[PDB]
Design a protein around this ligand. Structure first.
Ligand code: CDL
Ligand code: CDL
Ligand code: CDL
Ligand code: CDL
Ligand code: CDL
Ligand code: Q7G
Ligand code: LMT
Lengths: 53, 383, 57, 87, 106
């Protein structure tokens, strides 16, 4: 009976968690991209066109 | 969209049927507009009918006022239906473009024929009547959506940059509204959070003070021809009329909840005329309903209560934000492992570059210490 | 070829900084809206008391 | 290390420019010549002061490559020309 | 005391709690080298914030479901002294029930 009562909260919370994970993944992708850009910048092999792209 | 031979053939084949359909639509829309204009002149407020003058505080240039020169006919449903209003709006767009083309023809005589060939090779400025099949209509809508994508970001950037460079929000809620207003379409904007931007911009700029360049960008984004632009009070009048019709239809739908009963294609068209739902997104009914409800919420309760919509500039920005797609990014991340200045490797380093590498390289601390000690010794010897 | 490119290049740093700050603000707002909802459940003592009453004790 | 150039500066000192906050500051107190983080940024004093960054071999913990879904945006348009193609 | 069963909700996406936890662990495992610890009063990093949010949601869901693992709940859900009080209250209750069942069986 308790499980049935605490169910809609559970489903909505699970969907929200999945959405949050999908929202966070792009941030990590951007962070990795910036890391690589910084790496190439420190080597003096980065063009502004690449950075803008 | 760029011109093509296939579209040229399509439009050439359907030229005369398109003209005939345009004439029939012209008769029907003239009837509808006659009804609407009679109703406005009879039941319209004194200021709206008399065309009250609103002048700018700097150069005293007259322009339409949202509060006075725009009026919502809450009782228009008795005389005119929603479908008639949408038909009138579509015909207004088509008639504007046809009028510009006809004016060019009259001005240049028979020398506009090659320009007409250019015109028929693209669906951007042809009327909707020239499409006699579903696929042709889809291509035409795709061209219109492409033009909207091309034009809207410039308008949004103009507005945002001018405001941010010349002013700042007063309070935190205004800041949040302003920042969230100009988000890309990939994220969903909460109209309640965004609404205060309307009042803030009313404090900054109203529809009566809209600049001519911003107006040109907006008219581009609304598929309204801009050449010859002329004074800002002509296309401004066009914009005012179009949005007044849209607001009348929106009030009708909200009061009668027509959108719930509206079919899928009609709902998609209704959203499209509001610049909310691009056809290339292949939206479903759920997304269309969500966007329409967000639009109604942004209009706010006061729209139903008194027929007063929020600032038209901010409304246009909000609706056109759906065409502000995320900036494109193509190419695998592995491409970042390459190098861009390999062609310079043969040149090597000159004396100055070697000195800079030595001074600012990993040995920089040692060099700095040695240099400072030597300078101190020389200074002491001098004294 | 010369002017607009140079001014775009001049613009890049400030825009990058502001967009980074905006992303940080989004993350901060996401975090700040998280609250744990401690739930309260009917104490079993009352259940035991009702059980005793049903027994006619 | 290579002889390649870096992010352009325009002969300006970022510790005194009108947008100095946009340039990160390192431990030594020298603002970077670019939005990126620079550990060995320096300042030179000719008639006017100017900032410089010397490229060097430095290792940075590289986050694993993400999926193409989470960073690729296929919103390209016929009028769009990339900066590389433009160059 | 509660009332009516809440209105039914349809999931927008299909996914299991175990799958979500595995995905979270995979996401946080690649950034372990980049992730850097710091003082509690010092500002947090993006990785730390993501980890805290994800773990908070996960453990709230677990506690609601019934998986009462106090060791992790006290870590990823405690941010208020009220929450410490709640943990202490819940900790006593579980031990009391376990003892009561054992003696009632004995
Ligand atoms: C190949 C073709 C060649 C063509 C050449 C001819 C010129 C070009 C033709 C037209 C081109 C198309 C575009 C034109 C501009 C459009 C502007 C626009 O968007 O208007 C929108 C606007 C509509 O908006 P709206 O909201 O309805 O109303 C405007 C608001 O009121 C706005 O509200 P507001 O707040 O802005 O209110 C202010 C508004 C108020 O004004 C208006 O808007 C009202 C309309 C204009 C009224 C103008 C008349 C004013 C009274 C004149 C009195 C003269 C008395 C003289 C007596 C002499 C006795 C001896 O503006 C003014 O106050 C301006 C007043 C005018 C000042 C004139 C100063 C001139 C100085 C001269 C210096 C010296 C010259 C040299 C020396 C000469 C002497 C030796 O349109 C108008 O109002 C009227 C538009 C008229 C367009 C021009 C028509 C051209 C007809 C040409 C016929 C002849 C052809 C000859 C061909 C020859 C062979 C090739
Ligand atoms: C043969 C001589 C030629 C002379 C040289 C001409 C050179 C070319 C210049 C352009 C001429 C006009 C071209 C045709 C335009 C089509 C008709 C029209 O106005 O369409 C409505 C439409 C009105 O626009 P709107 O913004 O909606 O109007 C706002 C009003 O509040 C609207 O008020 P509302 O909100 O109450 O709504 C009313 C609406 C309600 O109605 C509806 O909604 C139903 C639809 C009605 C309009 C249907 C238009 C259909 C257009 C397409 C036609 C088919 C084309 C087929 C092409 C292919 C053929 C094979 O009905 C109207 O649209 C009525 C507008 C007022 C009438 C304007 C016509 C006046 C001239 C004609 C009379 C001339 C009498 C001469 C007497 C001589 C005595 C000696 O026209 C336009 O799109 C505007 C024209 C755009 C091009 C502008 C180019 C620059 C013009 C500068 C002129 C300066 C003065 C002349 C000298 C030039 C020197 C450089
Ligand atoms: C049968 C048909 C049905 C009946 C007729 C119906 C009516 C039809 C007419 C109305 C149609 C209206 C709609 C038209 C739409 C299309 C317009 C258009 O052109 O689109 C661009 C159109 C392509 O459009 P699209 O690809 O679809 O892209 C459209 C996008 O949406 C792009 O859109 P967007 O917005 O980005 O593009 C806009 C763009 C449109 O412009 C362009 O795109 C530029 C087009 C030309 C580019 C040329 C590049 C190549 C140059 C080659 C040079 C020579 C090379 C060597 C040749 C050697 C030969 C041996 O910019 C503008 O709009 C600028 C407007 C400028 C207005 C100028 C006003 C001046 C006023 C003067 C001042 C007056 C002040 C007042 C004074 C008052 C005094 C009292 O361009 C072309 O197709 C290029 C054609 C190039 C032809 C070859 C080069 C020229 C050949 C000349 C031959 C001369 C022979 C005689 C020589 C005699 C010597 C003595
Ligand atoms: C590296 C070197 C390369 C080569 C370089 C070449 C050398 C160039 C050097 C100089 C360049 C700069 C010159 C600047 C001059 C000053 C401009 C100025 O003051 O403008 C103020 C102002 C600026 O215009 P705006 O309206 O504010 O916005 C302009 C934006 O571009 C609007 O942009 P938007 O984005 O807002 O709108 C885009 C779109 C928006 O879409 C639409 O608007 C829909 C479509 C509209 C179609 C057109 C409707 C026209 C309605 C009637 C207009 C009034 C007519 C007046 C009576 C006729 C007068 C002739 O509109 C269009 O797509 C427009 C398409 C126009 C295509 C034609 C462009 C010219 C190409 C060359 C053809 C002619 C060659 C002649 C010489 C060779 C002969 C063998 O001009 C006007 O108010 C426009 C008045 C137009 C009057 C008609 C033209 C008068 C000039 C003489 C025409 C002679 C025709 C000869 C035929 C053939 C005879 C054999
Ligand atoms: C290849 C080359 C070939 C050769 C080329 C030869 C070139 C000659 C060079 C000299 C030309 C000088 C004039 C340049 C005009 C363009 C200026 C411009 O674009 O300024 C942008 C300017 C900048 O705006 P913005 O910065 O974006 O915004 C500022 C404000 O917010 C804007 O807010 P707003 O729009 O509310 O405020 C403005 C509006 C506010 O006012 C209103 O809205 C009320 C409108 C009142 C209109 C009053 C009209 C009165 C007419 C009386 C006629 C009576 C009948 C007479 C009959 C018998 C005699 C014929 O007032 C006006 O702008 C209208 C002023 C009066 C216009 C008069 C008609 C045009 C005369 C052109 C000739 C001038 C003399 C040339 C010779 C000397 C040169 C030093 O915007 C405007 O001015 C917009 C309106 C533009 C209208 C004029 C252009 C119309 C198209 C021309 C059609 C004819 C083409 C002929 C081609 C010939 C080829 C050979
Ligand atoms: C800017 C550039 C300049 C050059 C250019 O491009 C633009 O200008 C452009 C302007 C073009 C002309 C525009 C208009 C026509 C009339 C048409 O006519 C139809 C057939 C009949 C009429 O239907 C013809 O019957 C006439 O009927 C009339 C009575 O009705 C009689 O009176 C007349 O005697 C008699 O011939 C025949 C084609 C032609 C000449 C075009 C040729 C090509 C251009 C020179 C372009 C050319 C490429
Ligand atoms: C070359 C020119 C081209 C012009 C193209 C456009 C033409 C448009 C014509 C529209 C005609 C409308 O017809 C007109 O409508 C108005 C408004 O209802 C009526 O107006 C009537 O009612 C209004 C409102 O109570 C009263 O203020 C007015 O005193 C009275 O006459 C006119 O009696 C009628 O003649």
């Amino acid at each position: 009976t308790l499980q049935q009562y605490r169910r809609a909260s559970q489903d909505k919370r699970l969907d929200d968690l999945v959405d949050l994970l999908e929202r966070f993944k792009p941030v990590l992708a951007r962070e990795a991209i910036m890391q690589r850009l910084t790496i190439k910048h420190l080597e003096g092999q980065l063009g502004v066109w690449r950075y803008m792209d | 969209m760029q011109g093509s031979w296939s579209v040229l053939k399509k439009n050439c084949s359907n030229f005369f049927p398109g003209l005939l359909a345009f004439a029939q639509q012209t008769q029907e829309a003239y009837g509808i507009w006659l009804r609407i204009y009679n109703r406005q002149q009879k039941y319209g407020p004194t200021d709206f009918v008399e065309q009250s003058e609103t002048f700018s505080p700097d150069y005293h240039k007259r322009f339409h006022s949202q509060d006075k020169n725009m009026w919502v006919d809450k009782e228009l449903c008795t005389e005119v239906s929603q479908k008639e209003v949408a038909r009138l709006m579509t015909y207004k767009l088509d008639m504007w473009r046809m009028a510009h083309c006809a004016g060019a023809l009259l001005a240049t005589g028979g020398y506009a024929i090659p320009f007409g060939l250019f015109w028929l090779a693209n669906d951007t400025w042809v009327p909707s009547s020239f499409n006699l099949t579903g696929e042709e209509l889809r291509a035409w809508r795709e061209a219109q959506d492409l033009y909207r994508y091309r034009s809207a970001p410039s308008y949004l950037t103009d507005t945002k940059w001018h405001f941010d460079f010349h002013a700042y929000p007063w309070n935190e809620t205004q800041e949040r509204a302003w920042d969230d207003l100009f988000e890309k379409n990939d994220v969903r904007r909460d109209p309640k959070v965004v609404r205060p931007a309307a009042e803030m911009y009313d404090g900054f700029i109203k529809f009566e003070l809209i600049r001519r360049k911003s107006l040109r960008h907006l008219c581009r984004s609304m598929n309204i021809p801009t050449f010859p632009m002329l004074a800002r009070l002509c296309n401004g009048t066009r914009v005012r009329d179009y949005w007044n019709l849209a607001w009348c239809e929106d009030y009708m739908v909200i009061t009668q909840r027509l959108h719930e009963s509206m079919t899928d294609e009609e709902l998609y068209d209704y959203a499209w005329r509001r610049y909310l739902a691009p056809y290339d997104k292949n939206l479903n009914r759920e997304q269309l309903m969500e966007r329409v409800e967000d639009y109604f919420e942004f209009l706010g309760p006061d729209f139903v209560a008194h027929g007063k919509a929020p600032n038209l500039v901010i409304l246009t920005n909000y609706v056109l934000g759906y065409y502000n797609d995320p900036a494109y990014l193509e190419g695998d991340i592995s491409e970042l492992d390459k190098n861009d200045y390999d062609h310079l490797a043969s040149w090597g380093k000159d004396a100055f570059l070697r000195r800079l590498e030595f001074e600012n390289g990993p040995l920089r601390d040692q060099v700095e210490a040695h240099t400072q000690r030597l300078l101190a010794e020389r200074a002491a010897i001098a004294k | 070829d010369i002017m607009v490119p140079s001014f775009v290049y001049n613009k890049l740093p400030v825009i990058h900084f502001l967009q980074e700050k905006r992303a940080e603000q989004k993350l901060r707002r996401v975090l700040d809206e998280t609250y744990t909802e401690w739930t309260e459940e009917l104490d079993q003592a009352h259940v035991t008391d009702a059980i005793t009453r049903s027994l006619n004790i | 290390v290579g002889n390649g150039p870096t992010f352009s500066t325009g002969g300006e000192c970022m510790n005194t420019c009108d947008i100095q906050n946009a340039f990160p500051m390192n431990d030594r107190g020298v603002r970077s010549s670019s939005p990126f983080q620079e550990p060995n940024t320096a300042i030179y004093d000719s008639y006017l002061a100017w900032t410089y960054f010397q490229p060097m071999d430095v290792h940075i913990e590289k986050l694993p490559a993400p999926e193409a879904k989470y960073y690729q945006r296929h919103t390209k348009k016929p009028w769009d020309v990339s900066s590389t193609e433009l160059t | 005391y509660k009332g009516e069963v809440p209105p039914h909700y349809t999931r927008k996406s299909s996914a299991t709690i175990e799958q979500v936890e595995k995905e979270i662990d995979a996401l946080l495992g690649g950034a372990e080298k980049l992730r850097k610890t710091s003082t509690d009063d010092q500002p947090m990093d993006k990785l730390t914030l993501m980890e805290r949010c994800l773990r908070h949601a996960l453990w709230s869901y677990h506690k609601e479901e019934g998986r009462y693992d106090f060791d992790q709940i006290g870590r990823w859900v405690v941010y208020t002294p009220e929450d410490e009080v709640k943990l202490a209250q819940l900790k006593r209750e579980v031990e009391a029930k376990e003892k009561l069942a054992a003696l009632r069986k004995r």
